[PDB]
Amino acid sequence: HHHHFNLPPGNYKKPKLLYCSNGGHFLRILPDGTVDGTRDRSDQHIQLQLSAESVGEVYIKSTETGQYLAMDTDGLLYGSQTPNEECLFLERLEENHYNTYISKKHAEKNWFVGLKKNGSSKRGPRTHYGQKAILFLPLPV
């Protein structure tokens, strides 16, 4: 365990939007497997179904395309057709409020899901604790 275990409240019963307060983007998994953020609440690719593997581990799945959020070996977020080790994230409470998502595969490197202010996703190595890009709020769809 390389990380704390403060867990966020709530559950996985319903799909969520993952809203990044940094730039005010919803995490988006595009059909072509690219991942970014959009401020467009009506975007069909921001509806995400999270599900638990182990406690505090999640898959994050596009409801629209079925793609799993994943982070590849070079820290790039992508949409995976099938769940693999790159698709597991450690979902944690952060700053007593937000959700963060650390790549389980790369947890020892503290690679987070993050969106920059311009809506582009962060590359894993460019993320770290303390950033704004990594802070998400799950919103109802």
Residue numbers in the known binding site for heparin are 22
- DSSP state, residue 114: -
Judged by CB under 5 A, the chain residues 69 through 98 that form the site for Na ion are 80
In the complex, minimum distance from the CB of residue 1 to Na ion, in angstroms, rounded to a whole number:
26
In the complex, minimum distance from the CB of residue 135 to Na ion, in angstroms, rounded to a whole number:
27
Instruction: Name the one residue in this structure whose structure tokens are 């988006």.
Output: 28
The 3-class SS string of 61-101 reads EECCCCCEEEECCCCCEEEECCCCHHHCEEEEEECCCEEEE
- Residues tagged in the binding site annotation: 22
**Cβ proximity to Na ion, 13 vs 32, nearer residue:** 32
Instruction: Name the one residue in this structure whose structure tokens are 């809203």.
Output: 19
Binding residues for Na ion, rule CB under 5 A, total 1
62 binds Na ion per the rule CB under 5 A: no
Residues near Na ion (CB under 5 A):
80
